[PDB]
Design a protein around this ligand. Structure first.
Ligand code: PSF
Ligand code: PSF
Ligand code: CA
Ligand code: CA
Ligand code: CA
Ligand code: CA
Ligand code: CA
Ligand code: CA
Ligand code: CA
Ligand code: CA
Ligand code: CA
Ligand code: CA
Length: 1693
C-alpha cells in the first residue's frame, strides 16, 4: 500500500509536470457502454454522469444488463492543476413513473488518473459500482466506461472491439484492479505556529488608547482535494500558536497532490485579507525502498506583497495568493505532515495537537545566530534620474528598513546619485569605495540539508560543464583522442564526485523523518550513479551512445538537489528610490550560505560577486526596461564561524566616525552664535548634540589618522576619465502657474538629477576634449512632444517634479527639455546656505547667511578577527576600500541578428544595439528596413575599471547586455529585446584562444523574439596596452569590422530558389496585389524574379527558377537567415512591400548536388481492413483488396513528408507585430530551396541545377472527387446531446451544401457519399470540408472544419492524387479508378527519379526497372487469382509501384477543428480525396461507397416446457400454488412484446406451453450489431438510429385476475455468445450461467447463434433477491435464427 501510494504520486508527478499555464482549454469525453450484473430484480436502469459541474443523463433502458453506447462531452477551461483535482461522478439510478429515482451504485475517480494513462485516456474498462451508504456490502454491479481527456494538440487513441475486451470483467479489463485496496489514506497536517506575520489591520484601533506589531488576526486555511479546513482564529497576534491537526482524507485512487496552506487575516466587518500562500507538494516529499509523504516539523516561508500596511487596496495583492513568485517575506508557518493508511473518524477533521508532540517540536525551532554581509560592487543600467538610490538587504523580517523595531539595522547602503555613462545609461559611482551592508538574523541551523544541496549542485554544475564540453567537442568535429580525453575526464569527475558521503543526520536536533528518507534516497541514487560510472568506464568506448546516460545522470542529480524543507528564507535586495520601494531581487539563502564542511558544501556565490538583475514587483521577467544590473558580493554564514569571512573578504573594510559643525553670519563675520534651535557642535540635523570625544572605537576597532575636515570630497567626479567619446546633457527647465503662461525657471539649466548646472553657452570642453556637434539640440528620442518637452507637476513640500509625461496639460506647473551634443577625444571646507539647516552648497551667495562643514575621522579594524569586525558594530557607515584598480579592455563582436520583431508599418524595423558592460555603454549603427541586420561591428570599450582580484573577474565575469531597439525617426525608439551573455576573460597572453560567436537569444518579455550572433572578450590590460591584440580594420571612421579569426569563414555558395507561386495574397491598402514579384535576399546579395502581370490569371511565376551566388559561412551554425519579400508594382512607379518572411532553418534545404459472397462492395474492403468482422475472414481467403487506414491526416503521415516535398509553404507577414507575436498573415509564398557550395575554381564546371524536372506552371483544371466515409465522435450541437450532421464543402467559388441529405441524431454518422467537383488549381487549392448541424428552427452550428491543400495532392512527389490499390482490377466493384495505367505511372516515376524508362517484355512477365528485373512470379507465389484481374503487365507494374513508397489506396482520418476550441478535436472525419487533372484524360468509375442496409432477420424461439417455478405472488384467492407464463422480447423492440397462455394451478412448478416467438430485428453481420430505429417521443422531429448487441429477454411471470401482474425471474441470452444448454432439466442448475464477482468463477461455454443454427436444451431463469441469486425456474427452449428467404421457405406462423 505504501509502495502503491508512492508509485501513484510519482506517476501523477511525471504526468503533470509539463503543464504550468494559468488558463488552459480541455475536453472530456465520457462514454458509457454497458451495465452488467446490476443489483435488484425487474429494475429499470439509467445513468447520470457529472463532470466538473456539468451533467448529462442516458435514455431509459431495460433489464439488469443495460446497453447504452452513449457519449457525453464536457468542455471546460481552467488551470491544468485544477482539472486533475476535479472528479468524475458516475451514478446509476432506477427511475420510477410516480417517484424520484432511487440509487444502487456509484463510482468516483479524478480526472488526474484518467489523464495519467498513456494516450491520456483509459479505454473500455470496468467500474465497481458501490453503494455509498452501504460500501461494506461490496460491489452491487459493474459499469463499462471509456473516458478520454484531450489537451491542446492531443488526440484520442483508436478503438478495436475484438481486442480481448468483449465481456470478461472478472479480474480482467478493470479500471481499478482487485489487487489494490480501495482504502482511505489520511494525512495529519499538524499546524503548530506562525511567526513574523505583517500588519494587516488598521492601526487606529490601537493608537487612540495611547501594540502596533500585533495588528493581525490570523488563521490558516488548508485547501486539499476541493475541501477547505480552517483553523481557529488567534485574535491580535503576529506570532500565533494554533497547535491543531488537520485531518485531510482521500479515497486511494483519487489522490490530490497540492496542499495549499493560506494564512488569512480575519476581519470582522470586511473580507478576509490574504497574508500569504505556500504549497506542500506530496510527490516532492515522497518517493518510490520508498516512503510515504512525510514532512516537517519545518518552517515554510510565505512570499507576496510588501509588508508596509496601507488602508488602500494593495496593488500587489495577487502575489499573496501564490500567483507570481512574491517580492517580500510574509512570515513563515511551522507544519508537519504524517501519512497514515487508515480511516480516521470524520468527526476528527480538526483536533488539538497532543501535549507530547509539543515537547518534540521544541528541538526543531532552536535558533542560531547568523551574520550576513553584502559588498555592493556596481549598480548600472539605470534608466532613472532624480531622487537617490539606496539598496536594502533583508532576510526574513530582519533588515526591514520600514519596520518599526527600535534597533538601527544598518541594512542599507547610502543614497547615491546616478551618473551618466556618456552614451545611454546611468550608474552609481561607487568606484574604489563599495558600500557594505551588514545585518544579523536568527534561523534554525538546517546546514545538514543545505550542505548536501550545495554539494549536489556543485556535482550537477561540474557535470553540466563537462557535458557542454562534450557537446562542443562533437559539434566542432575535434579529433577523437581529445573527445575520448574529455569523456574520460567527465567519467573520472563523476566517479570522484559521487563517492561523497552525505552529512550524518545523527546527533542533530533539526533532523526530521523526511531528512532520513531523503538522505537514504540520495545515498542510493549516488551509489547507483557511481556504480554505473565504474561500469561505463570499463564497458564502452563510444561517447555517442554513452552520452544519453550522462543526461540521465544530470537529470537524476537535478532531482536530488530539491529540498522541500529549506526553511532558510531568501535574501531580498530592494532598490529604493526616494523613500519608495522600486525593484527587488531574490537570492536563495543556500546559494550564499557558508559551510565548514568545505567549498562544495558552501554556496555557489558564497563570498563571490554575482550578477543579479532586479525586477519590478509584478514582472514575470525583465521587460522593456531593466531597473538595475547589480553586482553584489554576498556572504551568509553562522556568527560562530564569522572569523572565516576573512578568506572571502577582498579589500579593507573601513568604518567612519561622522560629525558636523555649524556657524552663522553676524555683523559680517562668521561665528558659532546665531544658531537658533541648533547646537554649535552637532549632527546633520542640528538637533542632536554630539562631540568628537563621544565617538569611540568599539570592540575590535582602532582609530586611523586624526579628526579632519571632510567637505564631501570627490563630489565633482570625473565621469569621463577612460572615455574616447562622450555625450553631455543639460536639462533646460521652465515653470508656470497652473493655467498661466510659461517663463524660464529659477533653475533654468540643471543636470539629470535636478541639481543646478551651467547654461549651454557657459560650459566648454575640458582640455583633451573637443566638440563633435557645433551646437546643442533637443532630444526627440524620449517621452516628449514635438518640441522636446516633457511635463510635470509640483506638490508641496516637494520643490521639483518627480514624474513627467509626454503631453502638455493645464495642471502642469513645470516642463523639462533634454539638450545633448557629443564630443570626441571652498578649500576652507565649508558649505553655505541661506537658511539654517538648509541645503548647503559649494560657495557663498549674496543671501547665504549660514555655513556648515562636514567632518570625519577614519577607523580601521584592530584585532586578529580582521574583516570579521564589521559584524561587531553593535550605526556608522561601513565601506570597502580597494587599494588598487585593474584595467581591462572589452571587445564585443556584434556580427548579425535574425528573426527580430517588426515594429514599423512597412513590416520591417531599423534595428540598432546598445552594448553595455558595467559603467560603460556604446551604440552600434542603424541598419534600415530589415528584420535580419548585419551590423558587422566591433564595439570596443578601452580602459574599463573593474575592482577586485582578476581571478574573481575570471570566475564571475560581469555580463554584457545587448538591448536591441527599432529606430524611429519620430517618437521614442521601440524595444526589440535583450540578450545577456558573458565575455571570455583573458588574464594573460598564454590562454589567447580565439572567441567563438554564439546565437544568444533575444529576450523580449517571456518569449524569444529572435537571436543575435555575438561574442565578447575581456582582456586584462597590461602596461600601455601592449598585450592587447591588433585593432580591427575600419570600413568607416570609428567603425571596426569583426576581425578575420572571429568572423564566419565564407565560401562561394549557390542558392536555388524555386519561385513557384504565391497563394492567398490578402489586399494591401485599397487594392488587391495584382502585379507581384519575388525578392530573395541572403548574405547581402539579392535576386529578383520576373513580375507576374496578373496574379488572378496566372498565380505562378513564369521563370520558376532563380539563381544567386552568395558568400555563405562554411559552418552550418553561422548560416544567415533567408529573407523573402514580395513587391507589388502599382501606378506612379510605386513598389511597396506587401509581405515578408524569414527562414532561419536552412539545413533542410542543404543537398549534395552530385548525389454469401454477393454482398461484396467497398464496405467489404473497409470492414475487412479496419474492423473485426471476421479474423482471417472469408474476404481475405479470396484475396481481394485491403485499404490502408491512417489514424491521422495524410499530411501527418511521416512516410510522405507532409506532401510539401515538391515545394514547401512559408507564411508571409505584414505590419507591426501583434504584441511581440507574429504579425498579420497576408499570404503564403510557395516554393523550396537548394543550398549547395559552389566550386571556387572557375575552370571546374558548375554543379547541375537541382530543380531538374518541373511540372507545367500554368493553371490546370482538375476533377476532384471527395469520398467521405463516416464521422467519428463528433462534438454535439443539440440540446439532446446528439447532432444532425451533414457535409458542406467550399472549394474556391463553388459551394456544395448537403443539408437536404443530413443524417439525423448521431455522433457517429455513416455518410458514404461522394461529391464530385471541378476547380482550377492552384487558384482554388484550398479545399474546405466542414460538418454542420441541421436545425429546423435555429441557425446551423458548425461542428468542425479541415483544410486540404489540393495542390499538395496534385503536385506532390509521392502520387497522393490517387491512392494505388494492391490489385489491378478492371471489372466489378474494385475497378481501377485512376486515369493512368500502372505502366504509365511506373514510367512517370522512372522519368522522375533519374531512372531509365522501363522496358516491357513481349509476354509481359518481366519489367526491368532501375537496374533490377522484377517478375510477376515473385509476387504471385501462393496467391489466389480471380476473374476480375486485369492485364498481367499492369499487375506487375502496380506491384512494383507499391515498393516505391507511393501513397496507397487509403482512408485518412482528418481532425475537425473549430474556433470554439482552437487546438482540440471537435470530431474526426474518415474520408479521402482523389484529384484528377483533365490533361490526363477522364478517370475511371467512382467507388460506390454507399452504406449497406441492415439485413432483416427473424429470431425464432420455441417455449417447450418449464420446471421448478417459484410460487405465485398472492391475491384474493390466497392459496399456495404457482402460475407460469412466459414473456419474451428483444431490447429495443419492447413494442413487439408477446406472451404465452397462462398455465394456472401448477402444483410442482411445471408448465407445458409448446409456444412460439418470432421477433423481427435488423442486423449488420459486419458490425455484429442489431439495428433499431424509432422516434423517442411525440415532439421528436426525426428518427434516431440505435446500435445494440442482439440479445433475447425471456421472463417468467405470474398472472392474477384479482390483482396486478407480478414478476418472478428473468433470463438473458447474447445472440453472439449463446451459452450452451444442458440436455436435461436435472443437469440444468443455478449458476451454470456465469456469476461475476471474484475468485475465478466458472466460464460457461459459448457458441454463436448466427454460426451454429439450432440446438435444444434447458436454460435457467433467475432473479437477485437480498443480494443473492435465486433459482426462479428452468425453461426448455430451442433457439435458431432465420433470414428472410428462410422465413418465406418455411414459415412458422
Ligand atoms: C477609524 C478606523 C476605522 C476602520 C473601519 C474599518 O473597518 O476599516 C476597514 C478598512 C480596510 O481595513 P482592512 O484591515 O480590511 O485593510 C486591509 C488592507 N487593505 C490590506 O490588504 O492590507 O480600513 C480603511 O479603509 C482604513 C480607514 C482609516 C481611517 C483613519
Ligand atoms: C425561447 C424561444 C427562443 C429560443 C432561442 C434559442 O436559442 O433556441 C435554441 C433552441 C435549441 O437550439 P438547437 O436545437 O439548435 O440546439 C443548439 C445547442 N444547444 C447548441 O448550441 O449546442 O432551439 C429550440 O429549442 C428550437 C425552437 C426555437 C424557436 C425560436
Ligand atoms: Ca484586515
Ligand atoms: Ca483583522
Ligand atoms: Ca479586509
Ligand atoms: Ca517603429
Ligand atoms: Ca523604425
Ligand atoms: Ca443545433
Ligand atoms: Ca440539430
Ligand atoms: Ca441551431
Ligand atoms: Ca402474483
Ligand atoms: Ca397469480
Amino acid at each position: 500500500s505504501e509502495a502503491q501510494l508512492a508509485r501513484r504520486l510519482t506517476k501523477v508527478k511525471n504526468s503533470r509536470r509539463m503543464l504550468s499555464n494559468k488558463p488552459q482549454d480541455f475536453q472530456i469525453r465520457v462514454r458509457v457502454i454497458e451495465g452488467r450484473q446490476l443489483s435488484g430484480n425487474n429494475i429499470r436502469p439509467v445513468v447520470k454522469v457529472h463532470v466538473c459541474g456539468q451533467t448529462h443523463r442516458t435514455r431509459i433502458k431495460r433489464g439488469n444488463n443495460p446497453f447504452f453506447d452513449e457519449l457525453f462531452f464536457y468542455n471546460v477551461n481552467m488551470t491544468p492543476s485544477e482539472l486533475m483535482d476535479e472528479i468524475i461522478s458516475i451514478r446509476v439510478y432506477n427511475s420510477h413513473s410516480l417517484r424520484a429515482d432511487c440509487l444502487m451504485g456509484e463510482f468516483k475517480i479524478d480526472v488526474g488518473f484518467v489523464y495519467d494513462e498513456p494516450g491520456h485516456a483509459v479505454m473500455r474498462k470496468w467500474l465497481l459500482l458501490n453503494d455509498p451508504e452501504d460500501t461494506s456490502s461490496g460491489s452491487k454491479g459493474y459499469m463499462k466506461v471509456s473516458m478520454f481527456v484531450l489537451g491542446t494538440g492531443d488526440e484520442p487513441p483508436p478503438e478495436r472491439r475484438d481486442r480481448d475486451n468483449d465481456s470478461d470483467d472478472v479480474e480482467s479489463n478493470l479500471l481499478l484492479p482487485a489487487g489494490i485496496a480501495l482504502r482511505w489514506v489520511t494525512f495529519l497536517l499538524k499546524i503548530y505556529r506562525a511567526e513574523d506575520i505583517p500588519q494587516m489591520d488598521d492601526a487606529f484601533s490601537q493608537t487612540v488608547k495611547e501594540d502596533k506589531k500585533n495588528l493581525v488576526d490570523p488563521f490558516v486555511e488548508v485547501s486539499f482535494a476541493g475541501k477547505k479546513v480552517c483553523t481557529n482564529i488567534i485574535e491580535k497576534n503576529a506570532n500565533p500558536e494554533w497547535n491543531q491537526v488537520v485531518n485531510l482524507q482521500i479515497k486511494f485512487p483519487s489522490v490530490c497532490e497540492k496542499i495549499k496552506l493560506t494564512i488569512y487575516d480575519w476581519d470582522r466587518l470586511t473580507k478576509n485579507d490574504v497574508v500569504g500562500t505556500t504549497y506542500l507538494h506530496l510527490s516532492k516529499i515522497a518517493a518510490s525502498v520508498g516512503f510515504v509523504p512525510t514532512f516537517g516539523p519545518c518552517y515554510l516561508n510565505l512570499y507576496g506583497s510588501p509588508r508596509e500596511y496601507t488602508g488602500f487596496p494593495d496593488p500587489y495583492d495577487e502575489l499573496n495568493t501564490g500567483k507570481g513568485e512574491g517580492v517580500a517575506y510574509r512570515g513563515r508557518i511551522l507544519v508537519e505532515l504524517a501519512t497514515f493508511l487508515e480511516k480516521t473518524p470524520p468527526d476528527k477533521k480538526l483536533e488539538p495537537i497532543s501535549n507530547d508532540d509539543l515537547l518534540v517540536v521544541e528541538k526543531y525551532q532552536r535558533r542560531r545566530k547568523y551574520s550576513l554581509s553584502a559588498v555592493f560592487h556596481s549598480a548600472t543600467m539605470l534608466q532613472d534620474v532624480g531622487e537617490a538610490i539606496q539598496f536594502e538587504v533583508s532576510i526574513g523580517n530582519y533588515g526591514n528598513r520600514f519596520d518599526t523595531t527600535c534597533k538601527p539595522l544598518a541594512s542599507t547602503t547610502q543614497y547615491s546619485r546616478a551618473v551618466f555613462d556618456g552614451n545611454y545609461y546611468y550608474y552609481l559611482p561607487w568606484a574604489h569605495t563599495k558600500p557594505v551592508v551588514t545585518l544579523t538574523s536568527y534561523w534554525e541551523d538546517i546546514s545538514h540539508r543545505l550542505d548536501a544541496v550545495n554539494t549536489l549542485l556543485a556535482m550537477a554544475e561540474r557535470l553540466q560543464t563537462n557535458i557542454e564540453a562534450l557537446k562542443s567537442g562533437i559539434q566542432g568535429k575535434i579529433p577523437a583522442n581529445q573527445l575520448a580525453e574529455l569523456w574520460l575526464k567527465l567519467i573520472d569527475e563523476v566517479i570522484e564526485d559521487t563517492r561523497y558521503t552525505l552529512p550524518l543526520t545523527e546527533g542533530k536536533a533539526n533532523v526530521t523523518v523526511l531528512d532520513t528518507q531523503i538522505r537514504k534516497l540520495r545515498s542510493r541514487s549516488l551509489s547507483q550513479i557511481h556504480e554505473a560510472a565504474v561500469r561505463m568506464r570499463s564497458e564502452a568506448t563510444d561517447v555517442k551512445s554513452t552520452l544519453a546516460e550522462i543526461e540521465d545522470w544530470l537529470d537524476k542529480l537535478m532531482q536530488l538537489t530539491e529540498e522541500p524543507q529549506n526553511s532558510m528564507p531568501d535574501i531580498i535586495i530592494w532598490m529604493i528610490r526616494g523613500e519608495k520601494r522600486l525593484a527587488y531581487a531574490r537570492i536563495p539563502a543556500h546559494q550564499v550560505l557558508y559551510s565548514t564542511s568545505g567549498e562544495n558544501a558552501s554556496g555557489k556565490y558564497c563570498g563571490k560577486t554575482q550578477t543579479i538583475f532586479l525586477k519590478y514587483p509584478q514582472e514575470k521577467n525583465n521587460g522593456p526596461k531593466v531597473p538595475v544590473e547589480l553586482r553584489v558580493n554576498i556572504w551568509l554564514g553562522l556568527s560562530a564561524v564569522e572569523k572565516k569571512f576573512n578568506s572571502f573578504a577582498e579589500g579593507t573594510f573601513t568604518v567612519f566616525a561622522e560629525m558636523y559643525e555649524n556657524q552663522a553670519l553676524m555683523f559680517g563675520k562668521w561665528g558659532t552664535s546665531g544658531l537658533v534651535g541648533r547646537h554649535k557642535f552637532s549632527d546633520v540635523t542640528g538637533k542632536i548634540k554630539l562631540k568628537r570625544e563621544f565617538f569611540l572605537p568599539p570592540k575590535g576597532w582602532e582609530w586611523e589618522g586624526e579628526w579632519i575636515v571632510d567637505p564631501e570630497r570627490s563630489l565633482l567626479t570625473e565621469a569621463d576619465a577612460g572615455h574616447t567619446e562622450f555625450t553631455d546633457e543639460v536639462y533646460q527647465n521652465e515653470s508656470r502657474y497652473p493655467g498661466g503662461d510659461w517663463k524660464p525657471a529659477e533653475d533654468t539649466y540643471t543636470d539629470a538629477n535636478g541639481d543646478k548646472a551651467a547654461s549651454p553657452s557657459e560650459l566648454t570642453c575640458p582640455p583633451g576634449w573637443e566638440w563633435e556637434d557645433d551646437a546643442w539640440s533637443y532630444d526627440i528620442n524620449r517621452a516628449v512632444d514635438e518640441k522636446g518637452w516633457e511635463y510635470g507637476i509640483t506638490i508641496p513640500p516637494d520643490h521639483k517634479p518627480k514624474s513627467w509625461v509626454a503631453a502638455e496639460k493645464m495642471y502642469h506647473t513645470h516642463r523639462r527639455r533634454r539638450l545633448v551634443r557629443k564630443r570626441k577625444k571652498d578649500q576652507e571646507g565649508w558649505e553655505y546656505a541661506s537658511l539654517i539647516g538648509w541645503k548647503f552648497h559649494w560657495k557663498q551667495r549674496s543671501s547665504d547667511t549660514f555655513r556648515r562643514r562636514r567632518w570625519r575621522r577614519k577607523m580601521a579594524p584592530s584585532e586578529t578577527h580582521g574583516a570579521a569586525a564589521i559584524f561587531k558594530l553593535e550605526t556608522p557607515i561601513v565601506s570597502c576600500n580597494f587599494d588598487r584598480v585593474y584595467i581591462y579592455h572589452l571587445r564585443c563582436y556584434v556580427y548579425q541578428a535574425r528573426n527580430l520583431l517588426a515594429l514599423d508599418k512597412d513590416s520591417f524595423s531599423d534595428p540598432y544595439a546598445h552594448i553595455c558592460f558595467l559603467h560603460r555603454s556604446k551604440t552600434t549603427e542603424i541598419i534600415h528596413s530589415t528584420l535580419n541586420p548585419t551590423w558587422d561591428q566591433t564595439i570596443i570599450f578601452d580602459e574599463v575599471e573593474i575592482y577586485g582580484e582578476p581571478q574573481t573577474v575570471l570566475q564571475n565575469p560581469p555580463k554584457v547586455i545587448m538591448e536591441l531597439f527599432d529606430n524611429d525617426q519620430v517618437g521614442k525608439d521601440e524595444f526589440l529585446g535583450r540578450s545577456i551573455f558573458s565575455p571570455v576573460v583573458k588574464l594573460n597572453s598564454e590562454m589567447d584562444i580565439t572567441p567563438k560567436l554564439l546565437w544568444h537569444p533575444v529576450m523580449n518579455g517571456d518569449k524569444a523574439c529572435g537571436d543575435v550572433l555575438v561574442t565578447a572578450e575581456l582582456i586584462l590590460r597590461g602596461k600601455d596596452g601592449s598585450n592587447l591584440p591588433i585593432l580591427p580594420p575600419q570600413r568607416a571612421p570609428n567603425l571596426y569590422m569583426v576581425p578575420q579569426g572571429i568572423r564566419p569563414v565564407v565560401q562561394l555558395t549557390a542558392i536555388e530558389i524555386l519561385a513557384w507561386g504565391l497563394r492567398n495574397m490578402k489586399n494591401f491598402q485599397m487594392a488587391s496585389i495584382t502585379s507581384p514579384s519575388l525578392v530573395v535576399e541572403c548574405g547581402g546579395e539579392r535576386v529578383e524574379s520576373v513580375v507576374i502581370k496578373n496574379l488572378k490569371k496566372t498565380p505562378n511565376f513564369p521563370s520558376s527558377v532563380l539563381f544567386m551566388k552568395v558568400f555563405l559561412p562554411k559552418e552550418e551554425l553561422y548560416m544567415p537567415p533567408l529573407v523573402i519579400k514580395v513587391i507589388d508594382h502599382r501606378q506612379f512607379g510605386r513598389k511597396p512591400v506587401v509581405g515578408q518572411c524569414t527562414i532561419e532553418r536552412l539545413d533542410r534545404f542543404r543537398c549534395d548536388p552530385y548525389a454469401e459472397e454477393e454482398i461484396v462492395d467497398w464496405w467489404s474492403k473497409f470492414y475487412a481492413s479496419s474492423g473485426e468482422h471476421e479474423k482471417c475472414g472469408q474476404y481475405i481467403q479470396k484475396g481481394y483488396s485491403k485499404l490502408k487506414i491512417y489514424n491521422c491526416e495524410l499530411e501527418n503521415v511521416a512516410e510522405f513528408e507532409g506532401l510539401t516535398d515538391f515545394s514547401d509553404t512559408f507564411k508571409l507577414y505584414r505590419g507591426k507585430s501583434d504584441e511581440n507575436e507574429d504579425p498579420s498573415v497576408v499570404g503564403e509564398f510557395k516554393g523550396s530551396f537548394r543550398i549547395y557550395p559552389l566550386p571556387d575554381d572557375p575552370s571546374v564546371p558548375a554543379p547541375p541545377r537541382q530543380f531538374r524536372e518541373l511540372p507545367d506552371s500554368v493553371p490546370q483544371e482538375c476533377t476532384v472527387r471527395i469520398y467521405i466515409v463516416r464521422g467519428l465522435e463528433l462534438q454535439p450541437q443539440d440540446n439532446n446531446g446528439l447532432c444532425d450532421p451533414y457535409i458542406k464543402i467550399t472549394l474556391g467559388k463553388k459551394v456544395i451544401e448537403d443539408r437536404d441529405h443530413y443524417i439525423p441524431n448521431t455522433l457517429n454518422p455513416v455518410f458514404g457519399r461522394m461529391y464530385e467537383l471541378s476547380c482550377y488549381l492552384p487558384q482554388e487549392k484550398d479545399l474546405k470540408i466542414s460538418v454542420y448541424d441541421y436545425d429546423t428552427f435555429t441557425r446551423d452550428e458548425k461542428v468542425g472544419e479541415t483544410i486540404i491543400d489540393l495542390e499538395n495532392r496534385f503536385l506532390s512527389r509521392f502520387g497522393s492524387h490517387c491512392g494505388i490499390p494492391e490489385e489491378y482490377c478492371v471489372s466489378g466493384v474494385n475497378t481501377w479508378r485512376d486515369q493512368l495505367r500502372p505502366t504509365q505511372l511506373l514510367q512517370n516515376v522512372a522519368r522522375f527519379k533519374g531512372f531509365p524508362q522501363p522496358i516491357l517484355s513481349e509476354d509481359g512477365s518481366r519489367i526491368r526497372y532501375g537496374g533490377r528485373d522484377y517478375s510477376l512470379d515473385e509476387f504471385e507465389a501462393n496467391k489466389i487469382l480471380h476473374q476480375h484481374l486485369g492485364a498481367p503487365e499492369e499487375r506487375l507494374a502496380l506491384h512494383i509501384l507499391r515498393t516505391q513508397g507511393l501513397v496507397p489506396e487509403h482512408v485518412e482520418t482528418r481532425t475537425l477543428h473549430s474556433t470554439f476550441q482552437p487546438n482540440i478535436s471537435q470530431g474526426k472525419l474518415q474520408m479521402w480525396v482523389d484529384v484528377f487533372p483533365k490533361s490526363l484524360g477522364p478517370p475511371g468509375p467512382p467507388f460506390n461507397i454507399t452504406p449497406r442496409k441492415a439485413k432483416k432477420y427473424y429470431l425464432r424461439v420455441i417455449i417447450w416446457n418449464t420446471k421448478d417455478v417459484i410460487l405465485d405472488e398472492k391475491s384474493i384467492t390466497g392459496e399456495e400454488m404457482s402460475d407460469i407464463y412466459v414473456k419474451g422480447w428483444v431490447p429495443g423492440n419492447e413494442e413487439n412484446k408477446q406472451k404465452t397462455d397462462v398455465h394456472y394451478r401448477s402444483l410442482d412448478g411445471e408448465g407445458n406451453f409448446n409456444w412460439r416467438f418470432v421477433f423481427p430485428f435488423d442486423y449488420l453481420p459486419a458490425e455484429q450489431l442489431c439495428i433499431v430505429a424509432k422516434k423517442e417521443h411525440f415532439w421528436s422531429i426525426d428518427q434516431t438510429e440505435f446500435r445494440i448487441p442482439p440479445r433475447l429477454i425471456i421472463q417468467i411471470w405470474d398472472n392474477d385476475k384479482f390483482s396486478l401482474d407480478d414478476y418472478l425471474g428473468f433470463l438473458e441470452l447474447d445472440l453472439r455468445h449463446t451459452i450452451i444448454p444442458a440436455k436435461s432439466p436435472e443437469k440444468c442448475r443455478l449458476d451454470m450461467i456465469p456469476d461475476l464477482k471474484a475468485m475465478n468463477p466458472l466460464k460457461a461455454k459459448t457458441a454463436s447463434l448466427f454460426e451454429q443454427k439450432s440446438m435444444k436444451g434447458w436454460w435457467p431463469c433467475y432473479a437477485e433477491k437480498d443480494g443473492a441469486r435465486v433459482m426462479a425456474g428452468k425453461v426448455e427452449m430451442t433457439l435458431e435464427i432465420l433470414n428472410e428467404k428462410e422465413a418465406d421457405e418455411r414459415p412458422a406462423g
